[PDB]
Amino acid sequence: VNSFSGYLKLTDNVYIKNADIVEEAKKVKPTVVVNAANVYLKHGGGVAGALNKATNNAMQVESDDYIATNGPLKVGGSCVLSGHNLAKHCLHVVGPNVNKGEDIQLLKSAYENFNQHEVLLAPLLSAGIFGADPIHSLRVCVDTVRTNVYLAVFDKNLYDKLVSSFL
Ligand SMILES: NC(=O)c1cccc2[nH]ccc12
After folding, report:
1. What percentage of the chain's residues is helix, strand, coil (to nearest 5)?
2. Ligand 1 center to residue 86 CA distance, Å?
């Protein structure tokens, strides 16, 4: 049993809810929250900007030190950093950004990072301002992740379309 509440069950391991991931993280304090990161860990907008704002910019300060030491992530890659006030850990995962012309086949590689963690609170990778089709992102998630993933979808309209269209 875990603390996640109000989710619709899609599969054995994937759950979904219409929720603000920031508000969900603040309530649950999950072991892992996933950030929709870019390779520079520049948390300007979308899910990343919202998570970073909720940490009072401490996520960005920590991220800048990580990049100064290690250099940029790979598209499809990830790193584990602090979850600050939101979670124990933040798994920063880089899905391909269609608005930069990145290979959508890298979305499966991105989701494979989730398998290193038993339970996660996450957004749909490459959705929103990353430009991919969220229906596709949910399909890749279900077909790639084996660990228990609780998906937060901010937009109610999109949530209802993801559920209604789910095979
Ligand atoms: N760590 C895993 O890959 C995993 C997690 C939960 C259920 C699973 N079934 C087969 C693999 C697997």
Report:
1. 40, 20, 40
2. 26
Task: Give the Cα separation of 26 and 22 in Å (integer).
Answer: 6
Q: How far is the CA of 135 from the centre of ligand 1 (A)?
A: 23
54 to 20, 57, 165: CA distances (angstroms): 12, 8, 32
For ligand 1, which residues put their CB under 6 angstroms from it? 115, 146-147
The distance of Cα 42 from the centroid of its chain, to the nearest Å, equals: 15
Resolution value, angstrom units: 1.0
Which protein residue has the closest C-alpha to ligand 1 atom 8? 146
- Cα torsion 145, 71, 36, 166 to 10°: value is -30
